[PDB]
Amino acid sequence: TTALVCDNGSGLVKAGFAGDDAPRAVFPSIVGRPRHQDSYVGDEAQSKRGILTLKYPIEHGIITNWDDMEKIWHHTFYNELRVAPEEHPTLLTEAPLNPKANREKMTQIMFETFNVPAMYVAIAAVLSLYASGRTTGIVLDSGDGVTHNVPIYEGYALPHAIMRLDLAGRDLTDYLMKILTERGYSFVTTAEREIVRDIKEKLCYVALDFENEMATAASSSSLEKSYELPDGQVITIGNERFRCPETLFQPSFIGMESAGIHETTYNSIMKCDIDIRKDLYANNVLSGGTTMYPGIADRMQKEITALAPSTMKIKIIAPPERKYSVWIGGSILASLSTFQQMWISKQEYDEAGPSIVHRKCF
Amino acid sequence: YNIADSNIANLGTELEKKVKLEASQHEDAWKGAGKQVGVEIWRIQQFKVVPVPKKHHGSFYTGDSYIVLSTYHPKTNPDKLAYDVHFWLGAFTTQDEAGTAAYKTVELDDYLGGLPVQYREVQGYESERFLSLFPKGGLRILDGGVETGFHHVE
Ligand SMILES: Nc1ncnc2c1ncn2[C@@H]1O[C@H](COP(=O)(O)OP(=O)(O)O)[C@@H](O)[C@H]1O
Ligand SMILES: [Ca+2]
Ligand SMILES: [Ca+2]
Ligand SMILES: [Mg+2]
User: Fold this and answer.
1) Complete DSSP assignment for A243-272
2) Which leading EC class covers this enzyme (chain A)?
3) Using a 6 Å cutoff on CB, does residue A143 contact ligand 1?
4) Is the CB of A323 under 6 A from ligand 1?
5) Would A4-123+323-360 and A169-249 be classified into the same CATH topology?
6) Secondary structure E strands in A107-251
7) Measuring CA to CA, which residue among B113, B131, B115, B114 is closest to residue B123?
8) What H or E segment, with its residue span, contains residue A301?
9) A58 CA distance to ligand 4 centroid (A)?
10) What does the alpha-carbon distance between residue A39 and residue B95 come to, in Å, rounded to a whole number?
11) What is the DSSP string of A208-235?
12) Which of A141, A222, B16, B61 could be cross-linked to B145 through a Cys-Cys bond (beta carbons 3.0 to 4.6 Å apart)?
C-alpha cells in the first residue's frame, strides 16, 4: 500500500507517491475549452492554448469550479500517475483560513467519486516546516493563490497568529500584464496570461532598495532584459522586472490596502507569546513558487530587521527546493504509519460524512 | 478571517491533542520510554524509529538524524520525572531523516503528555544542554550513516 500525495496548488498540481523525494507529476491546474464558442486538462490544455480559453478551478486557494476540479483530479489519477485511486490512501493540502466547506467537499468527492480507501487534508505550511527539519518556526508560504504565515511551536500551529493574504503569484502575473502596456505591449487573453507568467518567472526579481532600483533603471539600460515571444517577436523589459514583485511588499500597487509580506510576517510573530518570538525570528522558512524571486530573502531580512527590536537575531531560510517543500513534507509524513493512523477511512466517511474531516485533520 | 468558519477552527483544541495522543500509541519505540532518569536514543532508519544501543549513546553518525530523550527529576519534586527531547541532525543527514526526526519528536512529546521541552540540535550547533548530556569525551561524530528512505525520482 503506497499513499499518494497530491498538493493541489492554485496554479500547479504536484502529485506523486509517498516515499519519493519529488512529485512525479507537476502540471498546470487548468481546464481549457474552445475559445470559439470538449475540454483539455493540464499540460495538453497549455499546449493547445492557441485555440483554447484557460480557466483555473482554484482561485486564492479555494475551489470555485467543482466540476472542473473533478476533471483535474481525474486527470491526475488516470492520465498522469496512471493509478486506480481506490487502491491508494491520498494526502491533500490546503491553505489555512479557507472556508470549512472547501475541505468538506474535497472529502465528499474523494470518497464518493474516487472511492479512495483513506484520506487526509493537511495545512500546507505545516508540511513545509517538517520538510525543513524543524518543529518550531514561522513559515511564509506563497503560491499562485495565497500568501500565508503560520507560526508553529513544538509542532503545533498557533491559530490566533496565522495570517493570510489573498495576494500571490496570479495577482503578480496580472499586474505584470498591466504594467507591460506602458511599454506598448498588449497581453490580455488567458493564453497571453500564461506567456506573461513565464516572463515573470524568468526575469523578475526583488530589489533590495526599490527607489534606488527605479533610479538605476532610468539612468541606463543596465537592468534591461530581452524575451522572445512564441511568435518570434522579441520584447524588452526594464523596471517591470522588479516593480512586479514589489507588490508583495507594497500591495497598494494593485490597490490593496493590506500590509506587505514583511509586515504580515512581523505581525504574525508579534501575535505569539513573547518568549517564543526569538525562535520564530531566527526560523523564518520560505516555501512556494512566489518565494523564488531572486533577492526576496535579502529583502525580507532587511525589512524584518527594520521592524524588529534592534538586537533581534533574524534568519530567513530559503530552501532551494521550496517550489516542492509542501509536497516533500507530505511525502515524509505520509511515509509514517502513525500519521496515517489519523487518516479518514472510507468506512468512517460512510458513517460520519464530510463533517469528520474537521475531527481528524489538523 | 472568521476562524470559527474556517479550516483552522479546531486547531489548539483538546480534540486536536486527543487525536494526536492516540496516534502516538501506535509507535513501538515509545513503549516504556521515559520511565526512569537517564538518556534514551533512537535513530531514524528509512522512516522507522530504531533504538540505539546504550553502548553507543553519545556517538552519532554525521549522515543521520536522531531523537534523544533526557529524563530527569525536576527541581519541583525529586520523585517525579520531567523531560528534554533533543533531535540531532547530522551535517550530512538527508531531508527524509531530518523531517521524520522532527515529526517523531513532536509525537514523543504527545506521548508524554506535552511535558517534554523540545530542542533542535544541528551538528556543530548543539545547545549547552545537549553538550551536558554526555560524559567527558562522550560526544563523538562518526563518518557515514544509513541510507535515505527516499526513492530518488530521476
Ligand atoms: N522563479 C520564480 N519566480 C517568481 N515566481 C515564480 C517562480 N517560479 C514559479 N513562480 C510562481 O509561483 C506560482 C506557482 O508556484 P506553486 O508553489 O506551485 O503555487 P501553487 O501551489 O499555488 O500552485 C506561480 O504564480 C508561478 O508563476
Ligand atoms: Ca543517513
Ligand atoms: Ca512539549
Ligand atoms: Mg501551494
Assistant:
1) HHHHHHH-GGGGT--PPPHHHHHHHHHHTS
2) hydrolase
3) yes
4) yes
5) no
6) 118-123, 137-142, 147-153, 156-157, 163-165, 225-228, 234-237
7) B131
8) helix A296-307
9) 11
10) 39
11) SSHHHHHHHHHH-STT-EEEE-TTS-EE
12) B61
The residue with cell 477552527 is B9
Give A130-167+259-317's CATH code, choosing from 3.30.420.40, 3.40.50.12710, 3.40.630.10, 3.40.50.300: 3.30.420.40
Residue B7 near residue A148, CB atoms below 8 Å: no
Q: What is the resolution of this structure in A?
A: 1.4
Query: Under CATH, what is the fold of the domain A169-249?
Result: Actin; Chain A, domain 4 (3.90.640)
By the CB < 8 Å criterion, does A100 face chain B? yes
DSSP assignment of B28-45, as one string?
Answer: GGGTTTTSSSEEEEEEEE
CA of B99 to the centre of ligand 2 (A): 12
Across the interface, of B3, B65, B152, the residue whose CB is closest to A21 is: B152
Rounded Cα–Cα distance for residues A237 and A239 (Å):
7
Domain boundaries, chain B: 14-142
